[PDB]
């Protein structure tokens, strides 16, 4: 079997184990986690499997080991603006993206797959999401972990979006495909979108973009309030978050 997509990230086994040990050292609330158990549960999800035949059930053992409650009122979701979202939680250190949780941290920027009836990780090729399989070891992992993360969110949930995208809100992102449809009005009062002016100077109100009106319509039918804010100056936004009641701001 040869796929269209790049193979498993080189040194995947080392990276997953080292990330697990580092995260559980930095976060003493997760010190109970056995990182050997985490590796065996992760590997066990997909090794010896046809990589388009991975289910959410295949990840249940890893999900159970990685069980974690972050403050439900301090969640940042993002779509197509990951690096700025991560920089935000690096400066506003009480807030969490999915990749600030143990399971999100383990898998961030990695690709992985195996092959039917072999014991080995495939470093040669993995199914491409677009060309081979929408349901692959990576997409199934992110669907299962991100649903659980979105489900747990409460009060005011923030989502960071990229105002320089053709579609500022799109339904193929993890956010647009799974997270937005798992915010529960039992827990969530408001979704507040931050539309980042991340490219050329652009003075326009991008909260009037048709895709933002689509997002507003989706979360209105979930009985959740919608708020939208332009971030015209993202670098100044990060600075002002670190040091508020200072400078220009």
């Amino acid at each position: 079997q040869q796929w269209s997509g790049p193979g498993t990230t080189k040194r995947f086994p080392e990276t997953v184990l080292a990330r697990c040990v580092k995260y559980t050292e930095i976060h003493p609330e997760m010190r109970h986690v056995d990182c050997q158990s985490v590796w065996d549960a992760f590997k066990g999800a997909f090794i010896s499997k046809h990589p388009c035949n991975i289910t959410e059930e295949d990840y249940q053992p890893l999900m159970k080991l990685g069980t974690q409650t972050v403050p439900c009122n301090k969640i940042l979701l993002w779509s197509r603006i990951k690096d700025l979202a991560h920089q935000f939680t690096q400066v506003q250190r009480d807030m969490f993206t999915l990749e600030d949780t143990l399971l999100g941290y383990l898998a961030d920027d990695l690709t992985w797959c195996g092959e039917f009836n072999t014991s080995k990780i495939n470093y040669q090729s993995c199914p491409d999401w677009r060309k081979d399989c929408s349901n692959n070891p990576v997409s199934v992992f992110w669907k299962t972990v991100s649903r659980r993360f979105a489900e747990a969110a409460c009060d005011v949930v923030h989502v960071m979006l990229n105002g320089s995208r053709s579609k500022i809100f799109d339904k193929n992102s993890t956010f647009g495909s799974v997270e937005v449809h798992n915010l529960q009005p039992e827990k969530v009062q408001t979704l507040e979108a931050w539309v980042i002016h991340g490219g050329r100077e652009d003075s326009r109100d991008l909260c009037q973009d048709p895709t933002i009106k689509e997002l507003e319509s989706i979360i209105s039918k979930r009985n959740i309030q919608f708020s939208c804010k332009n971030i015209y100056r993202p670098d100044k936004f990060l600075q002002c978050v670190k040091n508020p009641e200072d400078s220009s701001c």
Epitope: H181, Q184, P185, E186, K187, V188, Q189, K221, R222, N223, I224, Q225
Partner: antibody, heavy 121, light 108 residues
Framework: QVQLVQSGAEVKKPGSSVKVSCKAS????????INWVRQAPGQGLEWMGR????????YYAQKFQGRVTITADESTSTAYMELSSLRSEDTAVYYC??????????????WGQGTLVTVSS | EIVMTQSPATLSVSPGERATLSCRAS??????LAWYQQKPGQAPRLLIY???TRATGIPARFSGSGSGTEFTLTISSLQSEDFAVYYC?????????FGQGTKVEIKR
């Protein structure tokens, strides 16, 4: 809804499935939710799950996730609760109950008359 | 989940007299507390929401009080139609939880 009208009493063998209907007089009002609550004979009330009718979006108590399906059909103004792999301990009166559907108002203002489900060998 | 505990299990009250029912939450539920009346063969009926706000058409003799972990339903003069089971319910923390109820029976 102004009234919730449930289907009649059910008698089931263990391991079987039951589907209880809840017809909304006046239809599903915008931003109201249909909840399902059960009561074992001589015991208290237990919230099971709900549906947002306009998007047929269900949300379940962990106790019932994987065994209950709650749905709503806007076309017929009818909500359903299907409980599968029935156990003797599922013997209860099942109520559909309206709430406001938004954060901070999840109390139950309009209740169906209840449906008795008896599960026994 | 938040555990709701009601006391007493049974309250014997003379017609025309006052009933005081207690509801305790395992942790604070602010004022997001509802009260229901249930008679045999009937669905629960909403009496109070927001700890102290009477639902539409509920008589003035029913009053609710309390905040945080400790709540009271007072029926100031018991009519024959008020003899029933009473349940509290928190809507501060999902999943929604109910007390196991107080039966108000007729003293004679």
């Amino acid at each position: 809804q102004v009234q919730l009208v449930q289907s009649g009493a059910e008698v089931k063998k263990p391991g079987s499935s039951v589907k209880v209907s809840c017809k909304a007089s006046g239809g599903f009002f915008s931003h109201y939710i249909i909840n399902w609550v059960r009561q074992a004979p001589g015991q208290g009330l237990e919230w099971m799950g709900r549906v947002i009718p306009v998007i047929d979006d269900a949300y379940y108590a962990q106790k019932f996730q994987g065994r209950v399906t709650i749905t709503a059909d806007e076309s017929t103004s009818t909500a359903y609760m299907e409980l599968s792999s029935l156990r003797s301990e599922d013997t209860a009166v099942y109520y559909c109950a309206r709430s406001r559907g938004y954060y901070g108002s999840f109390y139950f203002d309009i209740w169906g008359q209840g449906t008795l489900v008896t599960v026994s060998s | 989940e938040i555990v709701m505990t009601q006391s007493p299990a049974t309250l014997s009250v003379s017609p025309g007299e006052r009933a005081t029912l207690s509801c305790r939450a395992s942790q604070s539920v602010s004022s997001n507390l509802a009260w229901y009346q249930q008679k045999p063969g009937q669905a629960p009926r909403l009496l109070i929401y927001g700890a102290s706000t009477r639902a539409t058409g509920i008589p003035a003799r029913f009053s609710g009080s309390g905040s945080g972990t400790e709540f009271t339903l007072t029926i100031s003069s018991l009519q024959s139609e008020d003899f029933a089971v009473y349940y509290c319910q928190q809507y501060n923390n999902w999943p929604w939880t109910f007390g196991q109820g107080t039966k108000v029976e007729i003293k004679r």
